[PDB]
Amino acid sequence: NLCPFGEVFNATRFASVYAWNRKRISNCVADYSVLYNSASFSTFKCYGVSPTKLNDLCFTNVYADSFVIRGDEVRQIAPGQTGKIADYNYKLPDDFTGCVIAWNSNNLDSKVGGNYNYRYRLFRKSNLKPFERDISTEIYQAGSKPCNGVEGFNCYFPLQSYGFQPTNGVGYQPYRVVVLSFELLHAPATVCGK
Amino acid sequence: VQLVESGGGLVQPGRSLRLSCVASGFTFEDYAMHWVRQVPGKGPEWVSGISWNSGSIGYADSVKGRFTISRDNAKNSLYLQMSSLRVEDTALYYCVKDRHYDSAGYLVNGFHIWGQGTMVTVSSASTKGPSVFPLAPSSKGTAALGCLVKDYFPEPVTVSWNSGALTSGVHTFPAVLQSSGLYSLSSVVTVPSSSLGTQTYICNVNHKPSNTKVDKRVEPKSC
Amino acid sequence: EVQLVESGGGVVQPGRSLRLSCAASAFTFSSYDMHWVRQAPGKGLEWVAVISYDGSNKYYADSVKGRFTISRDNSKNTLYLQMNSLRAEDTAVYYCAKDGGKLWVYYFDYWGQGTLVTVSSASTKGPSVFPLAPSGTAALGCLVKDYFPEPVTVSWNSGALTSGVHTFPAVLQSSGLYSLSSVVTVPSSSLGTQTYICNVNHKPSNTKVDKRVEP
Amino acid sequence: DIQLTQSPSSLSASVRDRVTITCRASQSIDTYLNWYQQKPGKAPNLLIYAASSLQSGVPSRFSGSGSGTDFTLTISSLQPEDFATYYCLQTYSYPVTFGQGTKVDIKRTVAAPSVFIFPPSDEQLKSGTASVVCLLNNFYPREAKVQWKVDNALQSGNSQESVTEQDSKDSTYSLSSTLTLSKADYEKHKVYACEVTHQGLSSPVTKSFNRGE
Amino acid sequence: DIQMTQSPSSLSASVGDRVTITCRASQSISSYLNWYQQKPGKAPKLLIYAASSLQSGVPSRFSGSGSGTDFTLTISSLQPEDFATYYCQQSYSTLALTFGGGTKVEIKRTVAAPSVFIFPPSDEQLKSGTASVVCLLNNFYPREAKVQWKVDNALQSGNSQESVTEQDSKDSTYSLSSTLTLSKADYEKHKVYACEVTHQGLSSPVTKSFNR
Questions:
Q1: Shortest Cα distance from A49 to chain C (angstroms)?
Q2: Domain limits for position A111
Q3: Which of chain B's residues have a Cβ under 8 Å away from the Cβ of D124?
Q4: Which of A12, B38, B62, C70 has a Cα-to-Cα distance from E35 of 20 to 30 A?
Q5: E strand or H helix at A109, and its extent?
Q6: Count of CB atoms within 10 A of residue C150's CB?
């Protein structure tokens, strides 16, 4: 049967970038041509593989990561990028093989009173390793005094809200991102394009 | 995909009820949930809503401070705690699925799936059987006669004519809630005047809440 | 033996549109992806767009996205590039390139000869040729100034004087026109005895000017 | 807190007609407005979301337009099954507020009601209460006034009305008004009448009776 | 995008020399790096793909190496037809293909000093309203040469255009022409018109000038 790409792209809501969802796709036939021409995409960049060649290739597993960021941060979802999102929220490896797809979701993720449900990790001591997901809410220690789970001076909550409003500039508007990873182990492949 | 309400019924004013809603056929955690009520014979009134992760909750001004909405995502259930039920709260309460997840300002926020609703009846008094009085055809080509079903509780009643043999020209009106907390209702039928002395007309009243059945013969009033 | 022939290039005003073609031969055209690569005057190479073998998937560079359209007709073995809303930045020589197809990624193995697309509002103006009089050999030449568009052919003595001639590439001055210099070094003894005439021809404007050069 | 006012509150159109309903918000709500169709005894069904976006499975003859404060719902070609009340609903701010609704009815020609009056029975009079009933049979449009007169005195605050749903055949309405008095209050008066005013009546029709004749 | 930086931008070698061109990437691109050769006025031709795979029909004297961010193309024995511009192009970012700046391999000859000539604008041009001052650098090597316009000892910047010919088939030298363009109103405003030339074959800057 067909691979469930529609469950990821057409999901009625998306996760925050710090708690990005991952869908493991296996043992199915994938129709990439219909998927990539379904909706209109503002960002479509592939790395290490052509999007027309996927219909001919087979992989052990295909990963479909999805999350929401703002417009000025879509450029960070790429191999070799740095920034608050790429370092503390979602990191792709330098030899990432796959495609990153994004589209404007101002109609879906922005509120009149502001949508503060989408968060991103603002404070973290070290950078995330490739494909790392940190959902910790421990109080960040910015000084020499321990915080002991209490917010205060040099003691910050590590998550920060976006606050999406439909009248903001396109750089501040919410964008839903889908990152397709194509893993090729030395094991029998289960996902072939067709 | 369904929304099934329970918990409604008869309750005395000033008391409390807890309404429940069991959701199935969709990801209950994927959507905001709302309560909308409708008084019999009137329009709709939105009551309360909740985001999903309890991130946003709202109430109509007429119910704020008295109602509490909540949801149990693990049980796919929505709840409405209705402390201090006024009479103005009597209505059929619909459990409704919202289109997305906001309860404030989403252009998409809509009431896409609706439950059948549960009835909350807030009034004094217990069960009472109705009295059935004839609406006899008067003397002053087509004549009209009827029956009056008065002073019963709770709803509903049913009225037929000549055991169902008379259906053309029959109008049975929706019941009204009197100030005493009891309901009343009427039913009428138009017939040719030439049959008023040869055709017997009898109305069949049925009030199941009180086990009352009454067969009233409606004759022209003799001087 | 892989051939690619382009056509459809020329002059175009800003904001107008132009369509290019690329006829393929001597290979399975309906099975390989195709590319468009442009090259600005004196600049490097810039990938423009790519189209799949069946033409169902199309991808464009950000510099031309929402402005150009790539397409192909497998029955005619031709590749197309509809260029709309052309800016001055689009002035370049446009190549079509066949995909190698031996890797998981794109790469160009064969290129077309290329066609020029010049985006400018300047009308086809004829050249104005001015002489350059000399002041241990000497030098003299002609100045082909104010002409649109490229090119102009400059020769000396109707092609008889070959040795010592240096014709310089044209430059696009601020007035939207081109300016070109052509010089020739001759022995200072045959100056008043040997007569020098530069032959300037401008086919786009159909202008042939012969000018004498004397000190 | 944000008031929605629909116009008209009642509409009469025939099959194939173009129906347009207006909904005005007390303040700007951008495109955050939904349209709902509700047939009596049924849950409201969503028709339009985001002011102009059609709901899945809703016929394309329904369409919405507008932004800010003025909006319109349009039925391009009216159908027999499209009789219902149509509500507009703002989703710009909380609380979620509805319009009063526009009852769309399938147009018929103007029809006058038939008026009948019924005295209280001797059986009820021994019960201590007297109920006088007035009947309005088969009229159109629905707008009709029933005035109770007890010895020519207009009775307010002691009678209640009830209107049937519009008949599916001749497209008429029917109304019943019930005047309630105690037995002591009943035997105090003689003439009991009910006056009926309607568009299909060039003048009010009055049916009456005298107690004890 | 991924920037490809080639080094050197120009090199001069003779037939038979071993030439090595370097290509650096702004980020790791694994082994997806290709090399292209472009003759002036001709279409590019593929030499190496996938960093080290030789294309069919390309002479074995071409070879590529490297991985990650640093790559090298090597011509073991340079031939007369190998004098051209060589580009590297990364293919890791399949939908954002980018080329290097290019490395033009030229013919090394002995250093040649330029012959500098200056030509005033002709009488037939001044009546049109434009004045162009021309400076010529004739037969010099290498290409690196600076032409500085001095009008009344004032450096003229933003007012001249340069043009260099291809290497001559006889002596393999270059030629440069600088055209200083100013309106007639600017022309009679000054007196001294000079052209300063700096070149490897000049022990000191040479200046050729004239008086109006």
A1: 5
A2: 6-120+163-193
A3: 131, 133, 148, 150
A4: C70
A5: helix A106-109
A6: 16
Using CA atoms, how far apart are residues E38 and E74, in angstroms rounded to an integer? 16
Subunit partners of chain E (3 or more CB pairs within 8 A): A, C
Cβ of B144 and D133 within 8 Å? no
> In this complex, is the C-beta atom of A157 within 8 Å of any C-beta atom belonging to chain C?
no
On whether residue A150 sits in a domain, the answer given is no
- Cβ <8 Å between D127 and B131: yes
Look up the CATH number of the domain holding residue D86. Answer: 2.60.40.10
- A112 and D30 within 8 Å at the Cβ level: the answer is yes
* Cβ-based neighbour number of residue E182 at 10 Å: 19
Task: Please judge whether A107 and D50 are an interchain contact, meaning their C-beta atoms are less than 8 angstroms apart.
Answer: yes
With touching defined as 3 or more inter-chain CB pairs under 8 Å, the answer for chains C and E is yes
Q: Which two tokens stand for residue C119?
A: 């985006």
Q: Contact, B115 vs B4, CB < 8 A?
A: yes
Same domain (yes/no): D118, D38: no
E135: distance to nearest CA of chain C, Å? 11
Strand, helix or coil at D180?
strand
Task: Give the C-alpha separation, D172 to D111, whole Å.
Answer: 7
Work out the minimum CA distance from E18 to partner chain C, whole angstroms: 25
Structure tokens, E204: 């000191």
Whether residues E126 and E103 share a domain: the answer is: no
> Which residue shows structure tokens 């001709």?
E42
Residue A153 within any structural domain of the chain: no
Q: Which chain E residues are Cβ-neighbours of A94 within 8 angstroms?
A: 27-28
Task: Say how many C-beta atoms besides its own lie within 10 A of residue B79's C-beta.
Answer: 20
D105 contacts D11 by C-beta, under 8 angstroms? yes
> Can you list the domains of chain C with their CATH numbers?
3-119 (2.60.40.10), 128-213 (2.60.40.10)
**Distance between CA atoms of C164 and E171, rounded to whole angstroms?**
11
Note whether A12 contacts B105, CB cutoff 8 Å: no
**Angle in degrees, CA E8, E3, E105, rounded to 5:** 25
**Nearest Cα to C155, choosing from C164, E162, E123?**
C164
The experimental method behind these coordinates is: X-ray
- CA separation for the pair C83, C61 (Å, rounded): 13
Given D42, D77, D106, which residue is the final one in a domain? D106
Q: Which of D106, D136, D162 is the last residue of a domain?
A: D106
- Documented resolution in Å: 3.6
The domain tally of chain A equals 1
What string of H, E and C letters represents the secondary structure of chain C?
CCEEEEECCEEECCCCCEEEEEEEECCCHHHCCEEEEEECCCCCEEEEEEECCCCCCEEECCCCCCCEEEEEECCCCEEEEEECCCCHHHCEEEEEEEECCCCCCCCEEEECCCEEEEECCCCCCCCEEEEECCCCCEEEEEEEEEECCCCCEEEEHHHCCCCCEEECCCEECCCCCEEEEEEEEECCCCCCCCCEEEEEEECCCCEEEEEEECC
E159 and E195 both lie in a single domain? yes
Report chain A residues whose CB lies below 8 A from the CB of E27.
79-80, 94
All residues of chain D having their beta carbon less than 8 Å from the beta carbon of residue A112 are 30, 32, 92-93
Any domain includes A142: no
- How many residues make up chain B in this entry? 223
Residue D26, domain extent: 4-106
| Pairing mode, strands C92-99 and C115-119 | antiparallel
Q: Does B31 touch chain D (CB under 8 A)?
A: no
Cβ contacts of D67 within 8 Å, gap of 6 or more: D30, D31, D51
Rounded Cα gap, residues A192 and B103, in angstroms:
42
Closest by Cβ to E27, choosing from A49, A51, A94: A94
Which residue matches tokens 């394009």?
A193
Cβ–Cβ gap A79/E96 under 8 Å:
no
CA distances from residue E85 to B202, C116, C215, E81, E171 in whole angstroms, order as listed: 110, 20, 41, 12, 20
